[PDB]
């Protein structure tokens, strides 16, 4: 094939142009996002029961839905939690590769059929089924600076005006309102209701009658009386539209004739659907929009379009309303793409310098300049064809490929330049021979590199999805580089290069290049003399190899492991947990101090603080809240002192002084979608209907035993909340029936007043919105207020709630968890310093076996993924290692010689581990992919030395040592040229302190350090390996 295109250079250009256009086309159509779909498909069923406790929600909603979640395909596990805010969330996680649309519709369909089994109040509110596994592109914040609008006023505006317009914007895949639109709030007064002998029952009944859409009919409707001329629709009673109309709602007409209206016995205003969450942005009232990227959409185009639409809305905003961007993931994607182009531009510039330093002719420096961009564009075409996207993982995959793409370009051109310099052939005849020496080897190298990376893509779950991004990108880039090396560069070499006279090594020149050529020719004789001496005493160098292999194993075990590196994302969170029974006001005072600290002591770092009172990830309530800290640009925060980790430590220590509150800061995970992914996720299951109280005692027992092993297990705590004091009220059935008071009127008056009641809908400025009746704050606070509420008996006498009720204090769960239908309690923890997560799980299983009868367990989330991933690893390494051997065995036509190549693997790994251990990094994905690439090129260097050495013995009949010494001499220059260019190419990635540095550091460190050793050791050890192996076997 190389011969075919040496004689047909225009054909070679056509294929190169076809590849370029395919790549250029692919670049335009290719999706662009920060990360691809890593987490397995998850469908979350969300329901709401206003004024309901955790147990009411669980026993009427959660359990009923869970029992009906059958006939659904490819379900791994089901998890749910029911809390005292009246909320339930059932997450169904599916097998990796499951269609998320088919998964959601199957879950949705089973819910629909289970809807008639749920309470009427839950059916009114409805039950949402959403794909929860998806993550946010950005969070658009909406604030009011002149204090003319509340969070309810802002929320309604965003919903009524902005939401649909942003939802319609090009590339937008989902928009969640951080708040609710207005609701008609009736704030009932018990003193006024009792005065007119009325109850919440009467208020609800009246609203349902006087705020309703009534069907009438038509004038002259069919079948008509013939002769009828006009046909008109009859409009009867329609929904109310204003607070005024609701105010005029008639409740009672007295004897004297005076009228009792709704405004007489209640305050009527537009407000929120709930008041559980209080959102503040730098202390000012705030709402916002959580925007998700659509499937196949371009993140940079989508965000630009979102800002463009908000810019057109700017002239129609009320005075004080402002747009802010506390969270935006596009700066990463833009930098990830920019630094990829920058790297590969600098890479081509670096090759040019090194190519001219050694070859000293511009005609030779242009062959890699053409070949490299062609292969890169080719990769984008294969990337698109396999349905992959331009993301952080695929982008750093191409940065790790350049070392292997550059090598192919140099090796081909350098070998032609050498053959001409030594034999004195014309470029055309020289290339034919030069390619003849390497064409069989490059095909062999291609098959080996495939066997290294391809099996890595066949990992299952989350880790397999991450590896697949690097695997396909490197294997594609590698594959195309070989085709371009067997088609284009041979044709280029034969036509573009200039003839070199036999024995012209550039020692006849003057100046710098004349001096350099003499130096290098002297250094080559020095090197070949060193190998000659090394091969006289192979025995001691085999000992020196085992020290490297033992030293490698030692470092590999002691190097701390972690999936992905912690990144400065310009955003982190501050959790605020107050004691059991703590109120909204108390939690706000703590959030105000957190906000005050960050805008005072971190004025030069923090841009804004988004204070969310009422919401937590570990559970909701008035006694929880999170502050989302938004930092300034990385260029306006120099040094490690002004980084997330530094600020995180300062904040944690600063808020340690605060009393009656657990306050601490922490950085976000590298991938928000996936989650923590550091430690284990344990589920403690009630397998024999033991109950909540007994499952708590078994949990406390497991935690107590975990605390007795600090050497193995660390920070082993429950994820859920603890039991809290709750006001138990017992309605006397006998006393109720005796006074002639119905239980419905009692349970309605209580539930409506204290809990709230969603009555029906009304239309506010052509927008259908909810009508809620509830007690005015001051009449539903303390147990003394219970007695102020009256219910009318059959005889018309008003009876106080105290007359037919008795109350006491008991403890109950404000958040009840369930795993796979059964009652559960989620326990988090991690392995102690030096210990692996796998070992920590072994003990947790052992401790769990000694728990009371009927108490089971299971592994969920990252733990479920790790175990099924750990089972695959051994089989994949084995497959990978067997095929590498089989390929090299076919290449060299020997079962023995392949070992000489495979013995170089530890030479690159030692340097990577030395670099990582020294710099204080972890055994992460970027590092692990960095090792596989380092092993790739180190093997590639050795493969050519062994092939050349073997061919000299087979063809020209040279001796073992003669051929080996001749091989290393010919191989020295192209090895040094490749290594020099690639080490300088990954220099910016190592020293990078700014944005996405955690990725670049993990990439650069392992590669650079590995390349240094893989270069310096291999040139002395490869000749030893080949000689020692050849001597042993025949």
């Amino acid at each position: 094939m190389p011969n075919f295109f040496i004689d047909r250079p225009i054909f070679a250009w056509v294929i190169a142009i076809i590849i370029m256009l395919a790549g250029g086309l692919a670049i335009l159509k290719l999706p662009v996002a920060q990360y691809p779909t890593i987490a397995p498909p998850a469908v979350t069923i969300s329901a709401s029961y206003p004024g309901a406790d955790a147990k009411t929600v669980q026993d009427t909603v959660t359990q009923v839905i869970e029992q009906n979640m059958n006939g659904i395909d490819n379900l791994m596990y089901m998890s749910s939690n029911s809390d005292s805010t009246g909320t339930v969330q059932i997450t169904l996680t599916f097998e990796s590769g499951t269609d998320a649309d088919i998964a959601q519709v199957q879950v949705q369909n089973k819910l629909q059929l289970a809807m008639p089994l749920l309470p009427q109040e839950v059916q009114q509110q409805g039950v949402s089924v959403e794909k929860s596994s998806s993550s946010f592109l950005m969070v658009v914040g909406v604030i009011n600076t002149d204090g003319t609008m509340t969070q309810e006023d802002i929320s309604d505006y965003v919903a009524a005006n902005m939401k649909d317009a942003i939802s319609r914007t090009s590339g937008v895949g989902d928009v969640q309102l951080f708040g609710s639109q207005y609701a008609m709030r009736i704030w009932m007064n018990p003193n006024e209701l009792n005065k007119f002998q009325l109850t919440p029952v009467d208020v609800i009944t009246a609203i349902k009658a006087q705020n309703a859409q009534v069907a009438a009919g038509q004038l002259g409707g069919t079948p008509p009386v013939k002769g009828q001329q006009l046909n008109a629709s009859i409009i009867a009673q329609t929904r109310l539209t204003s607070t005024e109309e609701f105010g005029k709602i008639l409740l009672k007409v007295n004897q004297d004739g005076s009228r009792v209206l709704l405004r007489d016995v209640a305050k009527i205003e537009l407000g929120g659907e709930n008041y559980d969450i209080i959102a503040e942005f730098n202390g000012q009232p705030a709402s916002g929009l959580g925007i998700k990227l659509a499937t196949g959409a371009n993140a940079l185009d989508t965000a630009a379009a979102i800002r463009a639409e908000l810019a057109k809305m700017e002239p129609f905003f009320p005075s004080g309303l402002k747009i802010v961007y506390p969270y935006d993931t596009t700066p990463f994607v833009k930098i990830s793409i920019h630094e990829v182009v920058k790297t590969l531009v600098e890479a081509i510039i670096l090759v040019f310098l090194v190519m001219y330093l050694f070859l000293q002719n511009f005609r030779a420096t242009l062959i890699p300049t053409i070949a490299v961009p062609v292969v890169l564009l080719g990769t984008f075409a294969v990337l698109a064809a396999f349905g992959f996207s331009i993301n952080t993982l695929t982008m750093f995959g191409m940065v790790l490929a350049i070392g292997l793409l550059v090598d192919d370009a140099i090796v081909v051109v350098e070998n032609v330049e050498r053959v001409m310099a030594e034999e004195g052939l014309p470029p055309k005849e020289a290339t034919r021979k030069s390619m003849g020496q390497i064409q069989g080897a490059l095909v062999g190298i291609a098959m080996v590199l495939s066997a290294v990376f391809v099996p890595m893509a066949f990992f299952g779950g989350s880790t397999g999805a991450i590896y697949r991004q690097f695997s396909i990108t490197i294997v594609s880039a590698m594959a195309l580089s070989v085709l371009v090396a067997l088609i284009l560069t041979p044709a280029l070499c034969a036509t573009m290069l200039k003839p070199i006279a036999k024995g012209d090594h550039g020692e006849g020149k003057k100046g710098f290049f004349g001096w350099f050529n003499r130096m290098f020719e002297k250094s080559t004789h020095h090197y070949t003399d060193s190998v000659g001496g090394i091969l006289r005493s192979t025995g001691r160098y085999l000992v020196l190899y085992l020290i490297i292999v033992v030293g490698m194993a030692y470092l590999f075990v002691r190097l701390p492991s972690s999936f992905l590196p912690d990144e400065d994302q310009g955003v982190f969170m501050t959790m605020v947990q107050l004691p059991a029974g703590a109120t909204q006001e108390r939690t706000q005072k703590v959030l105000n101090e957190v906000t005050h600290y960050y805008l005072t002591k971190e004025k030069n770092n923090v841009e804004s603080v988004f204070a969310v009172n009422g919401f937590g990830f570990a559970g909701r309530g008035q006694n929880t809240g999170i502050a989302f800290v938004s930092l300034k640009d990385w260029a306006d925060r120099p040094g490690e002192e002004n980084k997330v980790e530094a600020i995180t430590m300062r904040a944690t220590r600063a808020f340690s002084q605060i009393k009656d509150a657990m306050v601490f800061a922490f950085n976000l995970p590298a991938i928000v979608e996936l989650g923590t992914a550091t430690g284990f996720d344990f589920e403690l299951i009630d397998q024999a209907g033991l109950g909540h109280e007994k499952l708590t005692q078994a949990r406390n027992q497991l935690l107590a035993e975990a605390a007795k092993h600090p050497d193995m297990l660390t920070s082993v705590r429950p994820n859920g909340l603890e039991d809290t004091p709750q006001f138990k009220i017992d309605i006397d059935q006998e006393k109720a029936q005796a006074l002639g008071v119905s239980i419905n009127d009692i349970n309605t008056t209580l539930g409506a007043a204290w809990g709230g009641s969603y009555v029906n809908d009304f239309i506010d400025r052509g927008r259908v919105k909810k009508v809620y009746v509830m007690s005015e704050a001051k009449y539903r606070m303390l147990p003394d207020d219970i007695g102020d509420w009256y219910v009318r008996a059959a005889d018309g006498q008003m009876v106080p709630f105290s007359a037919f009720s008795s109350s006491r204090w008991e403890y109950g769960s404000p958040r009840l968890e369930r795993y796979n239908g059964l009652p559960s309690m989620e326990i988090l923890g991690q392995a102690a310093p030096g210990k692996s997560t796998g070992e920590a799980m072994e003990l947790m299983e052992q401790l769990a076996s000694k728990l009371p009868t009927g108490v089971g367990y299971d592994w969920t989330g990252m733990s479920y993924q790790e175990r099924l991933s750990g089972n695959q690893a051994p089989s994949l390494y084995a497959i990978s290692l067997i095929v590498v051997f089989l390929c090299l065995a076919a290449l060299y036509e020997s079962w023995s010689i392949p070992f000489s190549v495979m013995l170089v693997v530890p030479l690159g790994v030692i340097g990577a581990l030395l670099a990582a251990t020294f710099r204080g990094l972890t055994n992460d994905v970027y590092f692990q992919v960095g090792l596989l690439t380092t092993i790739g090129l180190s093997a590639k260097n050795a493969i050519l030395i062994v092939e050349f050495a073997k061919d000299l013995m087979d063809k020209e009949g040279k001796g073992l040592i003669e051929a080996t010494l001749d091989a290393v001499r010919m191989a020295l220059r192209p090895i040094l040229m490749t290594s020099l260019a690639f080490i300088l190419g990954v220099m910016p990635l190592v020293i990078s302190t700014g944005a996405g540095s955690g990725a670049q550091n993990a990439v650069g460190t392992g590669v650079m350090g590995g390349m240094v050793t893989a270069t310096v050791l291999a040139i002395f050890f490869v000749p030893v390996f080949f000689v020692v192996v050849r001597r042993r076997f025949s």
């Binding site: 004691p579 029974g581 406390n700 004091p725 006393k735 147990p783 008795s806 109350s807 006491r808």
Partner: protein
């Protein structure tokens, strides 16, 4: 106080070793959460016999009442902690203690049908004819629950 909140948690959780250390450092035994529950209230509720004795040795109020008038004996009797009920009564617990509803330890004991505790309360002089806010006695509860064994004891 600081130790007062730690003792409340310790007494509830049932960490005897932590309670011991807190009694030495001088943690407030009359400490109360928002609902008015002392460590003794909690210890009695969650059935921690050893801590009830330790708290009472360190001058804990045996007849402490919450914001609804319920005492540790009310809780111990209701949730069937026979050992704790005896300890409380030995240390001078008001056997006829009425909450805001007029409910007694005997009423609560009879309601869940704790036959042993009912006989212990009557031994220490429980008013068998004591009426709650609805005029219901422990006997009126027994016949309504359909507890023939409990019915015989209250005659």
């Amino acid at each position: 106080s600081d130790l007062g909140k730690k003792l409340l948690e310790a007494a509830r959780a049932g960490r005897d070793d932590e309670v011991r250390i807190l009694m030495a450092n001088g943690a407030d035994v009359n400490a109360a959460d928002v609902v008015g529950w002392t460590p003794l209230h909690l210890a009695a509720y969650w059935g921690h016999l050893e801590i009830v004795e330790v708290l009472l040795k360190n001058g804990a109020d045996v007849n402490a009442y919450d914001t609804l008038g319920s005492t540790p004996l009310h809780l111990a009797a209701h949730f069937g902690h026979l050992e704790i009920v005896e300890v409380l009564l030995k240390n001078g617990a008001d056997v006829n203690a009425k909450d805001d509803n007029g409910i007694t330890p005997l009423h609560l004991a009879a309601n869940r049908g704790h036959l042993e505790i009912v006989e212990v309360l009557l031994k220490y002089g429980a008013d068998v004819n004591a009426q709650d806010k609805f005029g219901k006695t422990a006997f009126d509860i027994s016949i309504n629950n359909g507890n023939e064994d409990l019915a015989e004891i209250l005659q």
